[PDB]
mmCIF file of C-alpha atoms and ligand atoms in Angstrom:
data_model
loop_
_atom_site.group_PDB
_atom_site.id
_atom_site.type_symbol
_atom_site.label_atom_id
_atom_site.label_comp_id
_atom_site.label_asym_id
_atom_site.label_seq_id
_atom_site.Cartn_x
_atom_site.Cartn_y
_atom_site.Cartn_z
ATOM 1 C CA UNK A 1 -13.564 6.205 14.799
ATOM 2 C CA UNK A 2 -10.778 7.433 17.056
ATOM 3 C CA UNK A 3 -8.337 8.190 14.234
ATOM 4 C CA UNK A 4 -11.053 10.162 12.488
ATOM 5 C CA UNK A 5 -9.379 9.179 9.227
ATOM 6 C CA UNK A 6 -11.602 8.370 6.269
ATOM 7 C CA UNK A 7 -10.747 6.071 3.375
ATOM 8 C CA UNK A 8 -11.604 7.782 0.087
ATOM 9 C CA UNK A 9 -14.065 6.003 -2.224
ATOM 10 C CA UNK A 10 -11.277 5.848 -4.815
ATOM 11 C CA UNK A 11 -9.189 3.758 -2.408
ATOM 12 C CA UNK A 12 -11.960 1.202 -1.999
ATOM 13 C CA UNK A 13 -12.675 1.153 -5.726
ATOM 14 C CA UNK A 14 -9.000 0.702 -6.660
ATOM 15 C CA UNK A 15 -8.577 -2.093 -4.132
ATOM 16 C CA UNK A 16 -11.741 -3.825 -5.325
ATOM 17 C CA UNK A 17 -10.729 -3.440 -8.962
ATOM 18 C CA UNK A 18 -7.345 -4.985 -8.207
ATOM 19 C CA UNK A 19 -8.891 -7.882 -6.293
ATOM 20 C CA UNK A 20 -12.014 -8.560 -8.370
ATOM 21 C CA UNK A 21 -11.089 -7.235 -11.794
ATOM 22 C CA UNK A 22 -7.428 -8.207 -11.740
ATOM 23 C CA UNK A 23 -6.982 -5.032 -13.817
ATOM 24 C CA UNK A 24 -4.387 -3.457 -11.524
ATOM 25 C CA UNK A 25 -1.068 -4.760 -10.208
ATOM 26 C CA UNK A 26 -0.528 -2.208 -7.452
ATOM 27 C CA UNK A 27 -1.834 0.898 -5.694
ATOM 28 C CA UNK A 28 0.131 3.353 -3.542
ATOM 29 C CA UNK A 29 -1.857 5.286 -0.926
ATOM 30 C CA UNK A 30 -0.993 8.418 1.062
ATOM 31 C CA UNK A 31 -2.512 10.696 3.716
ATOM 32 C CA UNK A 32 -4.059 13.899 2.361
ATOM 33 C CA UNK A 33 -2.728 17.300 3.476
ATOM 34 C CA UNK A 34 -5.093 17.611 6.437
ATOM 35 C CA UNK A 35 -4.394 14.045 7.558
ATOM 36 C CA UNK A 36 -8.133 13.397 7.549
ATOM 37 C CA UNK A 37 -8.337 11.002 4.613
ATOM 38 C CA UNK A 38 -6.249 8.328 2.933
ATOM 39 C CA UNK A 39 -6.202 8.780 -0.824
ATOM 40 C CA UNK A 40 -4.739 7.140 -3.923
ATOM 41 C CA UNK A 41 -1.390 8.506 -5.060
ATOM 42 C CA UNK A 42 -0.727 5.981 -7.806
ATOM 43 C CA UNK A 43 -2.164 2.888 -9.450
ATOM 44 C CA UNK A 44 -0.538 0.749 -12.111
ATOM 45 C CA UNK A 45 -0.970 -2.319 -14.298
ATOM 46 C CA UNK A 46 2.800 -2.735 -14.723
ATOM 47 C CA UNK A 47 3.882 -6.226 -13.642
ATOM 48 C CA UNK A 48 7.539 -5.253 -13.196
ATOM 49 C CA UNK A 49 8.408 -5.111 -9.480
ATOM 50 C CA UNK A 50 11.163 -2.565 -10.115
ATOM 51 C CA UNK A 51 8.589 -0.097 -11.449
ATOM 52 C CA UNK A 52 6.633 -0.529 -8.223
ATOM 53 C CA UNK A 53 9.740 0.174 -6.137
ATOM 54 C CA UNK A 54 10.290 3.289 -8.225
ATOM 55 C CA UNK A 55 6.888 4.579 -7.090
ATOM 56 C CA UNK A 56 7.710 4.397 -3.382
ATOM 57 C CA UNK A 57 8.944 7.643 -1.702
ATOM 58 C CA UNK A 58 12.499 7.824 -0.433
ATOM 59 C CA UNK A 59 11.728 10.279 2.385
ATOM 60 C CA UNK A 60 8.033 9.780 3.237
ATOM 61 C CA UNK A 61 5.723 6.987 4.378
ATOM 62 C CA UNK A 62 3.010 5.293 2.308
ATOM 63 C CA UNK A 63 0.775 2.238 2.290
ATOM 64 C CA UNK A 64 0.442 0.039 -0.772
ATOM 65 C CA UNK A 65 -1.262 -3.088 -2.016
ATOM 66 C CA UNK A 66 0.478 -5.374 -4.462
ATOM 67 C CA UNK A 67 -0.991 -8.377 -6.295
ATOM 68 C CA UNK A 68 1.892 -10.780 -5.807
ATOM 69 C CA UNK A 69 2.159 -13.815 -8.074
ATOM 70 C CA UNK A 70 4.475 -16.676 -7.155
ATOM 71 C CA UNK A 71 5.144 -20.326 -7.981
ATOM 72 C CA UNK A 72 5.695 -22.906 -5.245
ATOM 73 C CA UNK A 73 4.933 -25.837 -7.549
ATOM 74 C CA UNK A 74 1.206 -26.546 -7.155
ATOM 75 C CA UNK A 75 0.097 -23.924 -9.671
ATOM 76 C CA UNK A 76 0.825 -20.233 -10.165
ATOM 77 C CA UNK A 77 -0.744 -18.410 -7.241
ATOM 78 C CA UNK A 78 -1.155 -14.884 -5.994
ATOM 79 C CA UNK A 79 -1.569 -13.057 -2.710
ATOM 80 C CA UNK A 80 -2.677 -9.481 -2.165
ATOM 81 C CA UNK A 81 0.067 -7.928 -0.029
ATOM 82 C CA UNK A 82 -0.713 -5.003 2.282
ATOM 83 C CA UNK A 83 2.429 -2.909 2.694
ATOM 84 C CA UNK A 84 3.324 -0.264 5.262
ATOM 85 C CA UNK A 85 6.191 1.717 3.726
ATOM 86 C CA UNK A 86 8.057 3.746 6.337
ATOM 87 C CA UNK A 87 11.641 4.719 5.409
ATOM 88 C CA UNK A 88 13.988 5.082 8.370
ATOM 89 C CA UNK A 89 14.790 8.595 7.154
ATOM 90 C CA UNK A 90 11.165 9.773 7.010
ATOM 91 C CA UNK A 91 10.227 12.408 9.635
ATOM 92 C CA UNK A 92 9.181 10.941 12.982
ATOM 93 C CA UNK A 93 5.923 12.913 12.782
ATOM 94 C CA UNK A 94 5.067 11.178 9.519
ATOM 95 C CA UNK A 95 5.984 7.713 10.790
ATOM 96 C CA UNK A 96 3.670 8.369 13.730
ATOM 97 C CA UNK A 97 0.775 9.640 11.629
ATOM 98 C CA UNK A 98 0.999 6.711 9.225
ATOM 99 C CA UNK A 99 1.388 4.190 12.065
ATOM 100 C CA UNK A 100 -1.679 5.624 13.831
ATOM 101 C CA UNK A 101 -3.757 5.626 10.637
ATOM 102 C CA UNK A 102 -2.749 2.206 9.272
ATOM 103 C CA UNK A 103 -5.502 0.133 10.890
ATOM 104 C CA UNK A 104 -8.106 2.460 9.365
ATOM 105 C CA UNK A 105 -7.034 1.425 5.867
ATOM 106 C CA UNK A 106 -6.220 -2.174 6.726
ATOM 107 C CA UNK A 107 -9.657 -2.900 8.208
ATOM 108 C CA UNK A 108 -11.305 -1.460 5.094
ATOM 109 C CA UNK A 109 -9.771 -4.173 2.911
ATOM 110 C CA UNK A 110 -10.753 -7.841 3.043
ATOM 111 C CA UNK A 111 -8.868 -10.618 1.288
ATOM 112 C CA UNK A 112 -5.354 -9.488 2.257
ATOM 113 C CA UNK A 113 -3.023 -12.455 1.946
ATOM 114 C CA UNK A 114 0.110 -11.065 3.595
ATOM 115 C CA UNK A 115 0.937 -8.030 5.743
ATOM 116 C CA UNK A 116 4.346 -6.397 5.306
ATOM 117 C CA UNK A 117 6.011 -3.614 7.301
ATOM 118 C CA UNK A 118 9.040 -2.266 5.449
ATOM 119 C CA UNK A 119 11.683 0.020 6.899
ATOM 120 C CA UNK A 120 14.242 0.892 4.229
ATOM 121 C CA UNK A 121 17.565 2.501 5.138
ATOM 122 C CA UNK A 122 19.601 5.031 3.153
HETATM 123 C C1 LDA B 1 11.907 -9.461 -0.513
HETATM 124 C C2 LDA B 1 11.492 -8.152 -1.152
HETATM 125 C C3 LDA B 1 11.945 -7.010 -0.267
HETATM 126 C C4 LDA B 1 11.851 -5.766 -1.143
HETATM 127 C C5 LDA B 1 12.284 -4.519 -0.373
HETATM 128 C C6 LDA B 1 12.566 -3.426 -1.399
HETATM 129 C C7 LDA B 1 14.046 -3.070 -1.296
HETATM 130 C C8 LDA B 1 14.343 -1.975 -2.321
HETATM 131 C C9 LDA B 1 14.264 -0.630 -1.598
HETATM 132 C C10 LDA B 1 14.565 0.456 -2.624
HETATM 133 C C11 LDA B 1 13.582 1.627 -2.337
HETATM 134 C C12 LDA B 1 13.279 2.384 -3.667
HETATM 135 N N1 LDA B 1 13.391 3.867 -3.608
HETATM 136 C C13 LDA B 1 14.765 4.287 -3.511
HETATM 137 C C14 LDA B 1 13.073 4.419 -4.914
HETATM 138 O O1 LDA B 1 12.659 4.389 -2.777
#
């Protein structure tokens, strides 16, 4: 592809496990040092949203998938959320690299229920 970015096998496996095995609540992904591959930084079974927030970087970008459960009234449901985490304070170079590499990861995952772009401020 143009980006030349590869999605590590672990990324696919973690996503599949979360979707098919329901044995993971969330996964946080990051670019490797050479910016040639997206890898897994963290995976968790913790259902507490605050714990998830605690695993997101304050000064760097990341991507994440979260198995979101909610109740609208017709039966507890869930949606796999694809998240682009790009803090306002993160270096412009990083925001650019992650923005340019996002589609590579996104197109590798099927079954995404909601796409979220989050820009947190200090
Ligand atoms: C409607 C849900 C929106 C959730 C957005 C999350 C807001 C909390 C941002 C705190 C970021 C956590 N931190 C400092 C450790 O990086």
